[PDB]
Symmetry: C5
Subunit: 103 residues, 5 copies
């Protein structure tokens, strides 16, 4: 298995690493139908989503999507610095595939 | 996908944005049959609900309804300021579609 | 839907509101067979349970019973003040239907 | 239903209350197959388990076993003092049936 | 049942104890398909994973894998010191079987 977020991210096409090195500025959560998602922003203005679960996801990703949203909320609330995001860049806002944090 | 709670809110009929800019003043949770819901209030006097799951909701909203209640509870306990609420105004009290928090 | 805990409580038979205006004094949780329940007490001497799930509950209450136990635990741990409890008075100890918190 | 951990523990024939009055010293968690369990210790040296699920349990205990492990972790992390443990003392380590905490 | 992580770790082939005695340096979480996993690192240079669920896991391990990831997140966020890890050494990076914390 990969040993770093960059190694993992490189296994996928249409992805890139953002080096965030910052805490989340805003957290947005929606339960509206067909928009069941989370959006985060940083003081850089950069904005990222956890996508609504769809047919682009395999069954094993369903729990992992829910976990990713749990992680972003608690990351927001604790003011924890995010190090990198691995994101798909074929989505607007770019879509999170993985996150890393260091202290 | 939308980039902000206002953009997302505007995709739905019968909604409006409340700019709260404040922590939750009271949190109410019911496990009484047919009233399995959460109600929050603010110092300003406003009251909002997370509706009981019902036939107006689509399957994808089930998990998101539960997440929203989770979010409201930890937001309350941590005295986290809510920025905006996207609510449906055809319900009494108005019904939460989305929330945002800024730091 | 109701706007307050008292409104909600009054929709049900065999209920009453206790005004607690205090943090939980003690929290007890059991995984013992037939006694899978939570008990809370207050310095006033007042004791309440979340009932063991049973045939008196409907399916929409299953998640909500688990949520209520979750809420009592974290409310205890954080020394959060409880405003009111809606309880069923045809159980001993009285059984929690709904809870509100407010400082 | 019981109103205290003592009353509850008295309904079982191989149980014992351990008066702990202390925070958890160590927390151990395993996901190893057939050893999916939690072990806690205290400075007194006293060691306790949440048993692996099996035929010593009835179905109603399954969610409660997961809850109890959730409780021990957050109790450990928050340095929360445990008052009492009701345990089955026919197991090594003694097996947790219920927990109480007071402040 | 085992009374310590050391005893437990000894019941498995291809495992060893790592004495960590430190907080986690970095946390990585992926929801990318076929890489739904968590990676942790320490200042010692060691890297460990919670494996992607797979045919090597038995049904009783599926909730325990999710729990372990939950534990690693909150341990990271709270700067909690890890005592030992029981890991499988037939995986790269080595795969977490059990964790102990004291502190
Ligand atoms: O999500 C939509 O596309 C939608 C379409 C038509 C009505 C609508 O709102 C109703 O359902 C929501 C919950 O999804 C809420 O209860 C509103 O009060 C309803 O009007 C949403
Ligand atoms: O929720 C109702 O409309 C209802 C109907 C009949 C009985 C009832 O209360 C009983 O169940 C609650 C749990 O939902 C509690 O155990 C009471 O003690 C029971 O009487 C509610
Ligand atoms: O003594 C009793 O009344 C009693 C009832 C049900 C189970 C029980 O203990 C056994 O099961 C628990 C877990 O439910 C635990 O493993 C004990 O070690 C078992 O003896 C006692
Ligand atoms: O697994 C989710 C992933 O699925 C595909 O790879 C898409 O191209 C991405 O944009 C993303 O949605
Ligand atoms: O239970 C998980 C465990 O399963 C097997 O025994 C493998 O050999 C280990 O590498 C580990 O993956």
């Amino acid at each position: 298995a990969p040993q770093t977020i960059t190694e993992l991210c490189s296994e996928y096409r249409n992805t890139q690493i953002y080096t965030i090195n910052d805490k989340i500025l805003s957290y947005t959560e929606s339960m509206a139908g067909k928009r069941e998602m989370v959006i985060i922003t940083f003081k850089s203005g950069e904005t990222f989503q956890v996508e609504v679960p769809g047919s682009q996801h395999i069954d094993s990703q369903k729990k992992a999507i829910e976990r990713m949203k749990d992680t972003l909320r608690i990351t927001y609330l604790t003011e924890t610095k995010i190090d990198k995001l691995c994101v798909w860049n074929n989505k607007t806002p770019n879509s999170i595939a993985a996150i890393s944090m260091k202290n």
